[PDB]
Chains A and B, each alone.
With several copies, the nearest count.
Chain A
Amino acid sequence: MFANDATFEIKKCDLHRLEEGPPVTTVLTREDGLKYYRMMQTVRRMELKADQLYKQKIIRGFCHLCDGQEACCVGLEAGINPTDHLITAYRAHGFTFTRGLSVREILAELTGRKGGCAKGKGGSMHMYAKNFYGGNGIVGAQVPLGAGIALACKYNGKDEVCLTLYGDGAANQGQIFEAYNMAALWKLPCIFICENNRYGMGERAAASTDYYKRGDFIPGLRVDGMDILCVREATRFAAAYCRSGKGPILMELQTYRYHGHSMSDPGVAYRTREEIQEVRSKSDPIMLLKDRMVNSNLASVEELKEIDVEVRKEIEDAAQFATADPEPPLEELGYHIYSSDPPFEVRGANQWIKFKSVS
């Protein structure tokens, strides 16, 4: 027999212009623990498969992976409603899955096939789903977009909120500051979220690394981004704040990504590989959740091994669908340039090439 739920300690958040933050203690039911665990694993395995298909050259152009940051996408989803809105940058595979896309439609978008959620038209950086606005390749551009989505929530009067994510490297984009100002002035229910993984490609670049305070007049909290329950509580708190009418808030997530450190100075890259290995072994998100669930008697060691096995299977079914699936046919090159219009022609590489465009 298993414990039905248990209490855990979570890092206190540093606060900016708040007198109280989220609790330092929280309750995990075993049912939730199981669901969060499956979800983080599904994202971990999906990203390991994408890395494999990328290196095989089956996936092209970009393929930013988020393994290491699973506590973020799964924790954020745990703190909000399906009817809330979320937009992020290009490292979006996890979010695409936590907002309800299958591993199939995600990997098949990555391998550029007809069965991709975007029909092979977008690839890694541009995936959309219900109340998930991408998947956005221009650093910083998604922050105003999210502020707009938040404006739409306020305007519709339905008490929904918008989570608007940017990384530490994006944090010095001017348009983020333009957004902070309008959000605060118009009391938008926008949660401004800095995913801080210590790298923006390869404080060389930020005068302040206190991301949670950069909104100045907007309040902010700093959260342990490696702890799924910690992200869950902070998000619950941050969404409460916006729903209640108090305007925007900042949440800085302190997390870490295992991929995309292809530094070419040998000293720096050696050191970065050590760091990757330290973070993985001391604060891996999934491992952290596992230790907790076993240790509080919320689930069994072998029960999670069973989940790993079902997940390996889901991902394997999805990889082979994504490598066998046909590419979109050529005659659909010009499809979906405009919404709601009658069919028209688009020019190809010379005037004698015509593609039909339908909405």
Chain B
Amino acid sequence: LQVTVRDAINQGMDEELERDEKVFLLGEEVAQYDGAYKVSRGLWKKYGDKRIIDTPISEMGFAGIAVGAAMAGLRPICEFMTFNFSMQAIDQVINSAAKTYYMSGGLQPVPIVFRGPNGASAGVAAQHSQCFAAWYGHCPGLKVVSPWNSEDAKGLIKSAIRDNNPVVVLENELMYGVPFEFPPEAQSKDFLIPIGKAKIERQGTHITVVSHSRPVGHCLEAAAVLSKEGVECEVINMRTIRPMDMETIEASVMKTNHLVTVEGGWPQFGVGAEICARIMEGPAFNFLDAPAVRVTGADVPMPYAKILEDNSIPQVKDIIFAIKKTLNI
């Protein structure tokens, strides 16, 4: 059975709506339009105006209503049409949601989910290409996940809805239509993927390559290519950005002695920076036979013209090149 990332997320939301009438979905065009990228297709027809709510274009406002609905015990899924637009609402995400259970001394939980596509699209230019993983990962009181394939997406959405604290689910527009095979245990309405756990997507012994979201597939094509020359990459899909699963990255590095991180976001203070600093401060530092190095988006607002954009996002080539510098081959 092949299922696209978009359908995986949709199945996840459907199952959770069915399981718990406190769950509802709100955002721009989620209802009668069937979703801006069709993620919420069919949901309004099935659950009605009460559960699936089309909002005005008032991000701060509806993100805040959603947070308020969660404080009162409901369990909203608040969609941002892309994460670029959550900047107008980021006050509500951080100060009304992330910090509250703490400020209240554990009296006030906020079981809200924020979801939407994140990072780079194709030709949408600087205001619509921004990756927010490091921004949100920075904040205590949040959990932040960034799924890659269909399993990841369905299991993390469901974990997110089930969690009782604010969770930011950073999806990816270019992944929505990619089909994957979907083992019968993902098809289950009980399929959960725990937050805070990375997955090894490909065993290897020469180098550890860590990524999240769409570039994970690029690390897999790079590993397939390097493999024909005898170089075996252990490719790690982070899944969770906060709290990240560093332990799995450490065990891999003690085996391979080499680390390259790969991410689509801007480089400075980005996700790879944090993995490198951790690797350097943790028990695996000494096992490192070469500097940990970072593959990232180029450090520019995203340009429009095709050839500029291609050179603004990491490509398979760039991953391979960093891998070869690192293994000194």
Q: Which residues of A contact B294 (CB under 8 A)?
A: 350-351
Which residues of chain B in 69-125 are interfacial with respect to chain A, using CB atoms and an 8 Å cutoff?
A: 69-74, 84-85, 88, 91-92, 95-96, 100-111, 121-125
Contact (Cβ within 8 A) B101 A338: yes
Nearest-neighbor residue (CB-CB) of B62 within chain A: A182
Q: Are B125 and A123 in contact (CB under 8 A)?
A: yes
Contact flags (1/0) for A141-164 with B, using CB distance below 8 Å?
A: 101111111111101000000000
Q: Do A148 and B64 touch (CB < 8 A)?
A: yes
A-B contact number at CB 8 A: 307
- Whether the pair B32, A265 counts as a contact (CB closer than 8 A) is yes
Q: Do A334 and B300 touch across chains, with their CB atoms under 8 A apart?
A: yes
Q: Are B56 and A144 in contact (CB under 8 A)?
A: no
- A353, B318: Cβ atoms closer than 8 Å: yes
Find B325's partner among A155, A206, A352 (CB 8 Å cutoff). A352
A1 within 8 A of B: no
Name the contact of A178 in the complex, choosing from B60, B124, B125 (C-beta under 8 A): B60
The chain A residue sitting closest to B58, CB to CB, is A178
Q: Classify the interface of chain B: helix, strand, loop or mixed.
A: loop
Chain A residues, CB < 8 A from B183: none
What is the interface size of chain B, counting residues whose CB is below 8 A from a CB of the partner?
Answer: 90
User: Which segment of A15-23, A32-40, A110-118, A286-294 sits at the interface?
Assistant: A110-118
Among B84, B111, B304, the residue within 8 A (CB) of A120 is B304
28 contacts between A and B (CB under 8 A): A112-B306, A113-B305, A118-B104, A120-B304, A120-B305, A122-B104, A122-B304, A126-B104, A133-B108, A137-B125, A138-B127, A140-B57, A182-B58, A185-B56, A186-B53, A201-B33, A202-B32, A204-B54, A206-B56, A270-B32, A327-B306, A327-B307, A328-B305, A330-B308, A336-B104, A338-B141, A349-B296, A350-B294
Given contacts A129-B107, A147-B64, A149-B72, 10 further A-B contacts (CB under 8 A): A61-B124, A125-B127, A134-B108, A150-B68, A205-B55, A333-B311, A334-B300, A346-B298, A347-B299, A352-B321
Report A's interface with B, CB cutoff 8 A.
Answer: 60-62, 85, 87, 112-113, 116-123, 125-126, 128-129, 133-134, 136-141, 143-153, 155, 169-170, 172-175, 177-179, 181-182, 185-186, 200-202, 204-206, 263-265, 268-270, 327-330, 332-341, 344, 346-353, 355, 359
B contacts, CB < 8 Å to A:
24, 28-29, 32-34, 36, 38, 50, 53-58, 60-74, 84-85, 88, 91-92, 95-96, 100-111, 121-128, 140-141, 143, 163-165, 243, 267, 281, 293-301, 303-308, 311-315, 318, 321-322, 325
